[PDB]
From a paper:
As a proof of concept, we enhanced the stability of a marginally stable designed protein (called dF106) through conventional directed evolution. dF106 was created in an effort to computationally redesign the ubiquitous Rossmann fold of thioredoxins using Rosetta Design. Using the CPOP system, dF106 variants were selected, genetically resulting in a protein variant dF106-L11P-D83V, henceforth termed enhanced dF106 (edF106). This had a high stability with a folding energy of −48 kJ/mol. Crystal structures of stabilized variants showed small perturbations in helices 1 and 2, which rendered them closer in structure to the redesign template.
As two substitutions (E54Y and K79H) appeared to destabilize edF106 and the optimal substitution appeared not to have been chosen at all positions, we prepared an enhanced version of MM9, termed eMM9, in which the best possible substitutions at each position, according to the measurements of single variants, were chosen: M51K, E54V, L55V, T57I, V83L, L87F, I88T, and P92S. The similar construct of eMM9, however, readily formed crystals in several conditions, with the best dataset collected at 2.25 Å resolution. The complete model could readily be built into the electron density despite minor crystal twinning present in the dataset that challenged the data analysis (STAR Methods). Interestingly, the other main region of change is the start of helix 2 (α2)—the active site of the spinach thioredoxin—where MM9/eMM9 is again more akin to the natural protein. Thus, an all-Cα comparison of eMM9 showed an RMSD of 0.97 Å to spinach thioredoxin instead of 1.83 Å when compared with dF106. The structure also revealed that the destabilizing substitution E54Y presented in MM9, but not in eMM9, would probably be incompatible with the native conformation of Val2, which may have facilitated its increased dynamics following MM9 crystal formation.
Numbering used by the authors: 2 to 105
Write the structure that this text describes.
């Protein structure tokens, strides 16, 4: 689990050979903290089968702008360069494993 830079977008994410789950957050949010723990847990559970990253849209707004992501927290699923699925609102750890498995 770690932040990603616009710089590191393509290499770390778009080039990643594993499926990628990215959390777009603003900062100093409570709901974002809760989603961030959910995602931490999913990353460790699926450690070495997917890759999981964070986008602090305060610092890398170009990434959200690129993917037309207007709400935080947002969880995005990227596989082989393309955006495969997006989850907003209330994020269900149960649903994220459902998808993580869908693309695995």
């Amino acid at each position: 689990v770690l932040d990603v830079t616009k710089d590191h977008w393509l290499p770390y994410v778009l080039l990643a050979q594993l499926p990628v789950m990215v959390l777009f957050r603003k900062d100093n949010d409570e709901e974002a903290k809760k989603v961030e723990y959910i995602v931490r847990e999913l990353a460790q559970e699926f450690d070495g089968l997917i890759k999981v990253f964070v986008v602090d849209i305060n610092k890398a707004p170009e990434i959200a702008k690129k993917y037309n992501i207007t709400t935080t927290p947002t969880v995005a699923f990227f596989k082989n360069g393309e955006l495969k699925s997006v989850f907003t609102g209330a994020i269900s750890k149960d649903q994220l494993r459902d998808e993580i498995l869908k693309y695995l």
